[PDB]
Symmetry: none
Subunit: 80 residues, 2 copies
């Protein structure tokens, strides 16, 4: 399952160093849903966090990436 394409529907200015900043209409790539409000993604070659409320996500497809990783998933394997 490739990373999920999204487009910014509003401007966003990141508040911390972990967050992406982007303008309405920005092409975004989404690796993984982190929580209800947040995705891990990428904008213009930079990895960072993306607020869900500011984007529209392309769904012609995967649930693995669009749902947060579960505890049982994480703890079933050693850490990297």
């Amino acid at each position: 399952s490739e990373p999920i394409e999204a487009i910014a529907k509003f401007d966003y200015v990141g508040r911390t160093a972990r967050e992406l900043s982007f303008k309405k209409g920005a092409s975004l790539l989404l690796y993984q849903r982190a929580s209800d409000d947040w995705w891990e993604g990428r904008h213009n070659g930079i990895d960072g966090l993306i607020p869900h409320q500011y984007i529209v996500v392309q769904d012609t497809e995967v649930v693995e990436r669009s749902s947060p990783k579960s505890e049982i998933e994480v703890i079933s394997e050693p850490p990297e």
Copy 2:
């Protein structure tokens, strides 16, 4: 003694690999609620609840918290 959360100290820096995991520096004071598996604990660092890899900490030595919850325990009550 008794049922309190178990204290631990980070012996190595750790950067969380998923959104469920705590990140901490060597020497961090950690609080451990419940062993999740051999390699993982449910705990807390600096007010944030998350997962802590066993191999990165030293634990201060109930068995209740230091052993993973059993199936029979979990299935003995309804979901959830």
